[PDB]
Point group: C3
Chain length 461, copies 3
Amino acid sequence: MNTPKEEFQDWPIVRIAAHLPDLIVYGHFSPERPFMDYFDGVLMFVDISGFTAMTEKFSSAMYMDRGAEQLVEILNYHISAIVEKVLIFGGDILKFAGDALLALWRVERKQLKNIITVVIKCSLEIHGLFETQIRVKIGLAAGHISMLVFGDETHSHFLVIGQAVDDVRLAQNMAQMNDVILSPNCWQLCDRSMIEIESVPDQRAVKVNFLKPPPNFNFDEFFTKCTTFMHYYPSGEHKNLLRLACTLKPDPELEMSLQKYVMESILKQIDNKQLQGYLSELRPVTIVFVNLMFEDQDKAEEIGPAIQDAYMHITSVLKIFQGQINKVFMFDKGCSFLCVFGFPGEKVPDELTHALECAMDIFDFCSQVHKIQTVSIGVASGIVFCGIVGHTVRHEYTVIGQKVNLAARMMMYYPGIVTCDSVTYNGSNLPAYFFKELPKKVMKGVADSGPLYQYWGRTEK
Amino acid sequence: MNTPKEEFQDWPIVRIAAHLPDLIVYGHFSPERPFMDYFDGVLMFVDISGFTAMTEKFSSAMYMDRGAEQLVEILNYHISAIVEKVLIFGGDILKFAGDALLALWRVERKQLKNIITVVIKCSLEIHGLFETQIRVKIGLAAGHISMLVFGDETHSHFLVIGQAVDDVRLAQNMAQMNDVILSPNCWQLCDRSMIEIESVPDQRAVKVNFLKPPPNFNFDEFFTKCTTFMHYYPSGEHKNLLRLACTLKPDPELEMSLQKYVMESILKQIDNKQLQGYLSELRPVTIVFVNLMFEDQDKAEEIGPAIQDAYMHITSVLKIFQGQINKVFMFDKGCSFLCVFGFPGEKVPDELTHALECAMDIFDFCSQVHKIQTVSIGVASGIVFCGIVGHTVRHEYTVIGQKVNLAARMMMYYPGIVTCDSVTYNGSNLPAYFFKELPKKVMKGVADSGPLYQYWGRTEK
Amino acid sequence: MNTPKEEFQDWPIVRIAAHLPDLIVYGHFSPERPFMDYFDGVLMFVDISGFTAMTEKFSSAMYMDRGAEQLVEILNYHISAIVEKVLIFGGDILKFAGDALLALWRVERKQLKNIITVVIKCSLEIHGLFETQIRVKIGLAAGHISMLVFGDETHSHFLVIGQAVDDVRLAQNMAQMNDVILSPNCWQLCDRSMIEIESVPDQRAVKVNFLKPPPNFNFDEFFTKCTTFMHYYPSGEHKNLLRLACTLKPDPELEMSLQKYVMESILKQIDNKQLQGYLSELRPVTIVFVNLMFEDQDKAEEIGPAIQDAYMHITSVLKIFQGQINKVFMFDKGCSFLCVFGFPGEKVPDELTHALECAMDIFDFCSQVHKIQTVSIGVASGIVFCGIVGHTVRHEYTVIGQKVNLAARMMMYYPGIVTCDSVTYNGSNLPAYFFKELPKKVMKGVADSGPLYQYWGRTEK
Ligand SMILES: O=[Se]([O-])O
Ligand SMILES: O=[Se]([O-])O
Ligand SMILES: O=[Se]([O-])O
C-alpha cells in the first residue's frame, strides 16, 4: 500500500496568513471592537530606510519601464533575508512599513531576561548580513505591551502600544547605521554579564558593542532552552518550516476573521483572480497621512475607544472615494493612519480636490472625539512604489516613496492642521484663498520640499 | 558528469488527465460512437451530500463576496482526503457530482471476492476520516459493468451502466450516515469470513458492522497480493505517486482524444490562457436536467444507440445558446444529462425563455427516439456553485446547489413532461397559458420549492 | 535553532537568464556598440527541421483550436531532451531557431582536441534519443570564434561569426538524417585514435561512423578531467542543477543589461503581468527576412560597424510599425535579421503595404552602408507558430513555419532585391506596376511556392 508524499499546503487560508503575524493568526479573540489585550515581550525595530530610499532612482529612465519590478525584486531579496533571521530566532514579524519592520518575541515576564539575549544575537546576525555590501539600524525594547484591534464588520486593523513600543521607536531614532540600541528598561531587564555596552549622550538608552558570553556558554543549548517558552516555534515534524502558519488548514470561520485584515485586491490575487504581478507598480497617488495624539498614548483603555471612533468615520469618508487605509501604526507621537487615494486600480478623477475635502472632513470629525487631543494631517501627491514586500512566508502590501515620507513629516512638523504639498495645491486648482502658504521648516529626512500649504477650507471662519 | 533531478511532469496532457479516470486515460478504444465495452468490478458510491449541502450558507453576506472561494477551499480539503484514500487503496475515481463520487476497481471475475475486502476496508477508512468532525454514506456493489462512450467529432462523454451500477445507487439510497451498505450480489460474492453484517429491513442488501479478519490475516500482505491484479497501481520508481497518469508524456494523438471529454473553458485554464481561479464562482444559471428512461436500462447494446441519438440532438440544440452538458450519469432510473445555461462566461440574455424552448425541443425529439420510453425534464434557475472539485491529481468541473437538486427531483417526481420552477416561470414573462400550474409534491431532499409548473408549450394541441 | 530548506530561486533575473546563454549571462562586457570579442571553441549545430516541419499539420482542424498548444508541448518535450544532453555534457546553448539550435563549448586552444571528443559523444547520445521514435542532423566545427554584440540603449543582440561558424553550417548542410559531420578543421584538430570516420564526396569534411576509444579509456574520468576547463559547469553544492544561471541573485545593474536582449512581451510574462500561455499561438504575420552580405564575413572588425549601422536603421524603421526583430544569425552567407510584423499582440492594420515599404526603406539604407556588398530581403505572409521553445532552464521566443522558411529561401535565391510572396502581393492591393513578376526557382525545402514578385517600388526609376 503506497504512502505518497504529503504535498498540499497552498490553500487560500495559508496565503492569507502570510500577511499577518502569529499574534493575529493564532490570536482567537472576540470580534468586538475595540478589543484590547495585554502582555509582555521584547520588541525589535529594524530601520530599513537605507533600502527603501532607492525608490526615487528606480523611477529613472535607466530602468526602462521595469522600475517597480526591479525595485520589488531587490528589496525583497534583502528584506527576505532579515525576515528569515527573525523567524529562525523565534520572533513574530508584526508589521512592515516603508522605513521599518517591527518584530515581537512575546513571553512571560520571567523569561524577558534570556529572550533579550536571543534578540541581541539575532540583531547582530542581521547586521552581519549587510556588513560588506544599504545598512540597517536596530532598536530594542522590552516590557509591557498592549494590543488593540479595531474595525468594523468587514475590516480589522491592529496596533501595539505602550512604553515598550514608544521605547523601541526612541531606541531606533538614536541609532546610527549598524547600531543596536537598547531602551533604558531593556537595559535594566537584560543579562548584563552577556553584553558589553556604552553610554549614549543625554540618554539612559544604551548601545551594544559586543555580545561576549561566559566561558561555558553555548548559544545553541541556550536557544533550545528558550524555545520552551515559544508557543509557535516550528518543531518536530515541522522543524523544516519557517512558520507554523504554513501548516494552517482550511477553516471557514478562521478565514473569515483573517481576511478582514487584508485588502480586497490582495485577496483577489490570493484567489487566483488577478495576475500575481499586477500590484507591483510605480503609480501616482495622493497620500493622506492622519495623526492622532492623546493625553496619554500608553493607556489602551483610554485610547482604544477613541481610535475605534476615528476609524469608523475615516473608513466611511474614504469609502466614498475608494481611498484606502494602507496601515496604522503608532508614530513617535500618536496613532497614524496611512491613507491612500489611487493604488490597486482604485484611481478616481479629481483625486486632489477630494483628497483635501476628505482630509478636512476627517480633521473636523476627529477633532471632536473625546480624548483625541490633536489631529494633524499631511497630504502629498506623486509617484510612489506600491507592492507586496517581505518574504514568501511573511509579507505585506506596502507603499514606499519620498511623498509618503513627506506626508509623514508634514503631519509631525505642522501639528494641529491639514497641510499639503505643491503638487496637491497647484493640481487642485481650488481658489487660492482656500489655502495658507506656510513657513518653510527643515524636516528630518526631507530635502527640497517645495512650498507647503495649509488647507484652510472653504470659509474664512 | 552531473545527473540532475528529473522535474517536469506538468504538461498539458497531464493536466487534462486529472479530469479523467484511468478507464478513459488508458482505455485506447475506437473513436466510433456509441462505443460499448464490458467488464467486471467493484463499485463504491460515496454520498457527499452532507458536504455539498453547505452551498446555500456560503451565499450569506457573512462570507463577504468570497463565498465561492471559501466553499471550494473547504470542499476540496475534505474531498481530497477521500480521493487519496480511494487512490491508495487502488480505485479509479470515475466521476464526481454535487452529491457523490463514484469509484471503480476493475478486475477479472475471479478476484472480485478479495477486491471487495479491499474496498470494504477503504470504505471504513473513509468513514474514519470524518468520525469526530458532515459525514458520508457509502454503497458498494460488484458484478458485471458496461461502459458506454458517446459523442461527436469534438466531444466525448462516458457512462457506466448495468446491474452493479443500479445496485450501487440502491445500496447508497438505503444507507444512513456512516453506513457501508453492500448490494445483494456484492454480499453473495464477498468473503463472509472477513466481515460481520446485519440485515436491512425489506432488503436483500446488507450493512457492514465490522471487518474482523482471521487470526493470521495481515491486510498489508493481502493488499500486496491484490495489487498483482491492479494494472495501474503506482509502483517501483513511481510508488511515490497517487496516479500513474501523473507520468503521462506528450502524445498528440492521445491528447486529441482526451481533450474531447473536457470543457473548453477548462482547457483554456490548462493552457495558461485564463486565471486559475476564474472558474470558481457562485453564479446564476438555468439548469436543464434531462432524464431518459428505457425498457431495459442495463442493456448497453440497446440503450447505446438511443443515447447517442439523443446526444447528437441535445448538443445541437444547446450549441445554439452556449448551453453546456456538465455531466451525464445513470440516475436510479434512466440516463440523465445535466445541462447548464450561463456558467464559464457563457451567459446569454433571455436565458429563461430559451432554456424552456430548448427543453421543449429536446423533449420532442427524444420522445421519438426508438427505445426511449419516457423523457422528463426539470428546469430550475438560481445561484449555483460552479468549480473544479476534487484533488490536484483527480478533479472535475462540477455544479452544486439547491437549484441543481430541485431540477433533478422535478424530472423524477414529474415524469413524462417538462417542468420548471417559479424563478423560470415568472422570469420568462411568457404568457401564462404556455404553462400548467402543478400539484405540490413532497420531494426527497427538497423543502420550500415554491410553485412548480409544467411547460405546456405554445399551442393547446 | 531550525535550519529551514533554502527555496527561492525564481527571481525575475533568473527567468530572464533562461533566455540567454552563459556567454552573455556571465559575459560582463562593455555597453559600447558594436562590441567584439574573440575566442576558441567547439560548435554544435543540431538541425531540428524534422521537428519544426510539423507546424503545418497542427493548423489542421483535427487539433480543434489547440494546435499551437499541442505544438509547443510536443516540440518542447523533444527539444528539452536535447537541451539537457547539451547542458550535462557542459555546452552553452547559444541560440534557437525554427530549424536549429546552436551550442558552444568555449575553451582555451590546447583543450580543443579533448573537448571535441566530449562533443562527439554528446552528439551520439542526442542521436540515441530519437533512434526508434523525426530525427536530427548534427554538424560540428572547431576553431576561432568571434562574438559581436550590437544594439542601442534599450536593446541588444549578439552573433557569433568566423570560419568555425561558417564551417558548422557547411557541416550541417552536408549531413543526412542521423549523421554527425565534422568540419575539415574539426577533423584536423580532433583525436583521431578515438573515432572512426568516412570520407564525404567532394568534401574535406568527414562523417563520424563510430566513437571507439582505447582499452583503458574511461569516459567518466575523461569528462571529469575536461570539466577543469569548463568555467560554469554546475558543481559542489550545485551539482544537481542544469545551469549555474539558476542560482543568479538579484542585481539591478546585471538585470538592466540582460533584459535588453529579451522582447518586452516576454518580460511582461516574466513579471507576472501576462498569462504564462498568451505567447503560444498560431497567428498570421508578415516575415521580413533581411540578409546582408560582406566582402569578408569572418572579419568582425570589418563587419561589426556595418551591422551596427544597419541595426540602428532597421530598428527605427520597425519601431514605426511595432515590427520586431525576432532573431539575428549568420546564414550560410551573410548576416540575417528575422523581422516580424504582427506577433505578441503587436498587430497593425495594412500590415502588408507597410511591410513592403519598410522592406524597401531597409533595402535602400543598407545598400549604402560601407562594407555591405549586397542586401536581399524576402517578404512572406501567413500563419506561423509563435512561442517559447526549449527547456525550462534554457528557452527562447521563436517563430516557426513554412512562411518563415519561404522568406529565408527567397532572400537567398533572389539576391540583391526585395521579393514577396503571393499573399503579400495580392493582399497589398498596391498597383501591379509596383511589382515585377519573377521566374519560378526550385528552392531548397520549398514546394508549391505560388508566384513570387519583386517589389520594384513606386517609381520606374
Ligand atoms: O503600533 Se505598531 O507597533 O503595530
Ligand atoms: O452511469 Se455513471 O456511473 O458514470
Ligand atoms: O551567428 Se549565430 O551563430 O549566433
